[PDB]
Amino acid sequence: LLSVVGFAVDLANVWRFPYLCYKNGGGAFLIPYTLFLIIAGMPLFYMELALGQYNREGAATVWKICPFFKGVGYAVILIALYVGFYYNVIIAWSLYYLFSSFTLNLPWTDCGHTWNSPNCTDPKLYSKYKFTPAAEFYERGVLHLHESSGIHDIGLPQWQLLLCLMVVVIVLYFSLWKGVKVWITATLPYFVLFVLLVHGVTLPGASNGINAYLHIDFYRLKEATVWIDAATQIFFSLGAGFGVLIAFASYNKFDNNCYRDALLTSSINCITSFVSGFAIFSILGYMAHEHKVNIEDVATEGAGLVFILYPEAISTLSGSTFWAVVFFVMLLALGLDSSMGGMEAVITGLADDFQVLKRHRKLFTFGVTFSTFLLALFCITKGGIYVLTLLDTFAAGTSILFAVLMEAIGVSWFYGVDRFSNDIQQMMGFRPGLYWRLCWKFVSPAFLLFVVVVSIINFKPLTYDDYIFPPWANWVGWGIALSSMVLVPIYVIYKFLSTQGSLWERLAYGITPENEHHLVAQRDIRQFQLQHWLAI
Ligand SMILES: C[C@@H]1NC(C)(C)CO[C@@]1(O)c1cccc(Cl)c1
Ligand SMILES: *[C@@H]1O[C@H](CO)[C@@H](O)[C@H](O)[C@H]1NC(C)=O
C-alpha cells in the first residue's frame, strides 16, 4: 500500500534513469533494462532480502554462511561509501534549486541574468547545448563550470554549494545518529510524475519526444554500453549490490514475506521507469520543438539532465513557482531518504562487524558523515561536475556488477541454493521454486559475468558532454573501481592465511557456515561431496 510504494521510488529512479535513458536512445534502453529486471534483478533483490532477513546480519557480517566472502560485504560497503560522495552533491543541487525557486520569476527561464554569457539564446526572442537559459543556469549559475578548464583544473568549492552540502550533511547526521529509526514523502514523487506525464504529453512537440521514445533502434542494442547502463541502473535503483537491502531486511520480521516485496518492488520499478522515461522524452520533444534543435542534441546526457528538463517543464505550468517548490521538495526528500538509506547500510554493516563501533553510534555516524562531506568537497568544486562524472561512472560501475556477481556465486554455489531455498521455506512456508533457483544459480551469474567482462573489455574513455577526460582521469576511475573490487580476493587470501590448520582444513573453515564449524573436524562437509554442485 505505502511501504512498497515509497520503498520503490528512489532518487536513483527520477535522476539517473532519465539521462541514462536519453543518452542510450529512447525505448532502446528499456529492452535491456526490462530484460535484466526480469532475469537478473528481481531474483537478486529477492535473494538479498531473504539473506538479510534470515541471517539477521548486515551487509558485511551476513557472510558467516561462507566466510571467504566477507570481502564481498566489505566491497559493497565501500561501493556505498563511494556513491555517498556524489549522492550528497545531487541533494546539494536540489537544495540550491529549492532555494533559488522561491522567486516569482524563476531564474532558469530568461537569461538577462549575471551568470549568462554573451552567447546565450532565449527561444522567446550551432551548439544549442549550454546556451539555453536553463542550461546556462545549471552550468554557469549553480555549478560554475565556466571557471574550470577540465578535470585537471578544478577550483575551490562554490560557497553556495558548500553551504548546501554542509546543510545536507548536517541533516543526514542529525537524522542518522540515533539508532536506525512519512506517507507523503512516499506518495509525492508518484504524483509529481503523474502531473509531469499528463502536462508534458499535452505539450507541443512532445509527440516527437514520445515517438523517439517508442522508436526502438536495434543497432544500439547490438552495442555493449546500453546493456552495461541498464544493468548498473537496475542495481543502482533496486538496491541489490549496495548492502542496503540486507541491512534493511535484517530488521524485518522473520516470517516476513520477502517474495511479495520483491514482486511488488520489481513491478513498480518497471512501471514507474517506463512512465518516467515517457514523461522525460515528452519534455525532451517539447524542448527540441521550442529551441529549434533535434531531440538527440537538445540537452546534456550527463548527470545534470533532469536539472535542465524539470525546470524546463516547471516553467511551462501555471503558477510555475509552486510547482518548482513542490518538485524540488520532492527531489530533496527523495535524495535525503536515499542517502540516509545508503549511510545506514554503511553504518549498520560496519557496526554489526565491529562491536566497538556499535557501542558508539554518535561517533561512528560523525566519522562517516564527515568523511562523505570532505570527499564531496571535491565534487562541489568549480570543475566538480567532472569528478562527479568520474565517480558516477566508476564508483558503482563494473564494481557493483562484480560485487553482486560474487555475492550470487557465494550464496548459490558455495552456500548452496538448495540450502538457501530451505532457509526460505523455513521463514516463509513455501519453497522459492524452480524459476528463482535457476535465476540465482545459473542465469543471474551468467548475465552478470557477461556484463562484467563486457564493461571491462568494452570500456569507452570517460568524457563529459564535449569534454574528453584525460587518460589519467580514466586511470583514477579504474583505480577507484578496482579498490572497490580488489577486496574480495584480498579477503580470500587473508582468510586462507589466518586460519590454523591443514590446507583442506583452511579451505573448509572458510567455506562452511560459522556455527557448523564442529562438523568440519570430521572431514565431512557438503561442498566437498561432489553432489552439492548439482543442486539446480
Ligand atoms: C543510490 C542507492 N539506491 C538504493 C535503492 C540502493 C538505496 O541506496 C542508495 O540510495 C545509496 C546506496 C549507497 C550509498 C548511498 Cl549514499 C545511497
Ligand atoms: C559565441 O561564442 C563566441 C566564442 O565562444 C563569442 O565570441 C560570442 O559570444 C559568440 N560568437 C559567435 C560567432 O556566435
Fold adopted by 3-495: Amino acid/polyamine transporter I (1.20.1740)
3-state SS, residue 468: strand
- Residues comprising the binding site for dopamine? 10, 80, 236, 301
Q: What is the DSSP string of 87-122?
A: HHHHHHHHHHHHHHT-SSS-TTS---SSS--TT---
Helix intervals (H) in 238-354: 244-250, 258-290, 306-314, 320-353
The atom of ligand 2 lying closest to the CA of 118 is 9
For residues 283 and 202, is the Cβ–Cβ distance under 8 A? no
Distance CA 323, CA 334 (A): 16
Experiment type: cryo-EM
Domain boundaries, the chain: 3-495, 499-536
The protein residue whose alpha carbon is closest to atom 10 in ligand 1 is 338
Cα angle 8, 11, 17; round to 5:
90
From ligand 1's centre to the CA of 11, what distance in Å? 8
Of 232, 238, 226, the C-alpha closest to 44 is 238
For residues 403 and 482, is the Cβ–Cβ distance under 8 A? no
Distance CA 309, CA 200 (A): 11
Residue 232 cell numbers, joined: 548498473
Number of continuous H segments (helices) and E segments (strands) in the chain: 25, 0
3-state SS, residue 232: helix
**Whether the CB of 426 sits within 6 Å of ligand 2:** no
For residues 25 and 222, is the Cβ–Cβ distance under 8 A? no
Distance CA 349, CA 61 (A): 7
**Residue 292 Rama label (left phi>0; alpha psi -120 to 50; beta):** left
Distance CA 332, CA 330 (A): 6
Classify residue 178 by burial, with Cβ atoms within 10 Å: 0-12, 13-18, 19+: exposed
From ligand 2's centre to the CA of 497, what distance in Å? 64
Cα 231 vs. chain centroid, distance in angstroms? 11
Q: How far is CA 55 from each of CA 49, 61, 437, rounded to the nearest angstrom?
A: 10, 9, 19
Residue 70 cell numbers, joined: 566477507
**Whether the CB of 19 sits within 6 Å of ligand 1:** no
**Whether the CB of 422 sits within 6 Å of ligand 2:** no
- Which residues, 6+ apart, have CB-to-CB distance to 463 below 8 Å? 469
Half-sphere exposure of 389 (CA within 13 A, CB side): 24
Instruction: Extract long-range pairs of 468-476: CB within 8 Å, 24+ residues apart.
Output: 469/150, 469/151, 469/386, 469/389, 469/390, 470/150, 470/151, 470/152, 473/151, 473/386, 473/390, 476/390
- Residues comprising the binding site for Na(+)? 6, 8-9, 13, 237, 269, 337-338
